[PDB]
Amino acid sequence: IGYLFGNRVLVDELPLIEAYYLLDKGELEVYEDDKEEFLKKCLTYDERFLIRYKAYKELRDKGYTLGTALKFGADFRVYDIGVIPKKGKRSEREHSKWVLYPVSKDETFDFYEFASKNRVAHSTRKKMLMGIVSDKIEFIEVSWKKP
């Protein structure tokens, strides 16, 4: 039901991460002209795709809803379980409730990077959400104490 065109999949356009989720779940078929095929293309575009996807799939399966947080410089914003992106005139905290940084367990960072990640979360009145990825995935919520 989908057509791959550059870094979007057109259905009825979707980012590659959302199209991969549905293909992996079984409610989407893709096609270049006319799966390891689509993943290879996704990784060509985004080297961190698997890192981002593993975290993304994890939370969306658990009932969380994710949207882009690029305007803030983060990978995803994350609404709590029982959701509801839209709500009314808001206002369940508005892009609400965690800024998510999918990250590899073997990736290095300095604490300038750490402080930066928390500062942008703080600037949106959210809660920095760090999701370490390896064989397993662990989600760490960081709060700015004062102190």
Partner: protein, 152 residues
Amino acid sequence: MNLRIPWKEVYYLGYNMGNYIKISEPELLFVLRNKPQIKDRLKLDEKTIIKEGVKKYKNFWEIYYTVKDLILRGYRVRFDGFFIELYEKGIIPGTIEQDYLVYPVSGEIRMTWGELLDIYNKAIARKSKFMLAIVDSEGDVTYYEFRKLRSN
């Protein structure tokens, strides 16, 4: 180091061993700088303690600055060799469990994410809340509390 001095007179830093206080170099630097009477009383040198401290801990200035920040805010603390134990305002160390275990770092320190989680898991194994303390080049400190996410 082992000082034969009343515990209250070293800001309740270190461990009261009964007959003496067992106190680390970064904690002692704070007491020497803010209670200079102790220098002549107990015969200790500021520069010497820095020297012994920076070869013992890596890490030393960040412990010092974090200890200093927390005592000057009205808390009671002690360095356990790895974490700073942080106690709520009013209470003396060892009376009850600490509120937080805090790990002090500088900005320049480079670490793996799995290694940061190990440090956090170490505080969890101690059944305690964890707080990261990042100390800048002016010695000012910012604190970040960690929690695992799960409803479930």
